[PDB]
Design a protein around this ligand. Structure first.
Ligand code: CL
Ligand code: CL
Ligand code: CL
Ligand code: CL
Ligand code: CL
Ligand code: NA
Length: 129
């Protein structure tokens, strides 16, 4: 599923991401835009053999099991394929664990390079929330 901007904002708000660990909703929408272009089916392979999955490009090196990342962890206790669903619940719940692990949203490279320090409220401007 390719979300619209306001559609995704509303879904993330319903799932408790607005101001989660102090990160306003626009931070999460901005991260999703630049990580996946709002596409739940996005995958990308990393140099070390791990793979990033879904709307927030969660990495199999630490967070999910895809059966092809030897020596990795599965800290969200999910198969990576669950992060590709049209229902974003699994991605949001895993993202909550990630952002709570000490480094905040700096875990998302695209957030750090394209969202951090910008006017992220623009990503939810005009949306009915
Ligand atoms: Cl957009
Ligand atoms: Cl915001
Ligand atoms: Cl594995
Ligand atoms: Cl949902
Ligand atoms: Cl933080
Ligand atoms: Na893994």
């Amino acid at each position: 599923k390719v979300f619209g901007r306001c559609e995704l904002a509303a879904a993330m708000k319903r799932h408790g991401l607005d101001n989660y660990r102090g990160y306003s909703l626009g931070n999460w929408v901005c991260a999703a835009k630049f990580e996946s272009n709002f596409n739940t089916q996005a995958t990308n392979r990393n140099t070390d053999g791990s793979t990033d999955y879904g709307i927030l490009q969660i990495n199999s090196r630490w967070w999910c099991n895809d059966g092809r990342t030897p020596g990795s962890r599965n800290l969200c206790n999910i198969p990576c394929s669950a992060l590709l669903s049209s229902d974003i619940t699994a991605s949001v719940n895993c993202a909550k664990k990630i952002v709570s692990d000490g480094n905040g949203m700096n875990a998302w490279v695209a957030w750090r390079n394209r969202c951090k320090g910008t006017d992220v409220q623009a990503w939810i401007r005009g949306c009915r929330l």
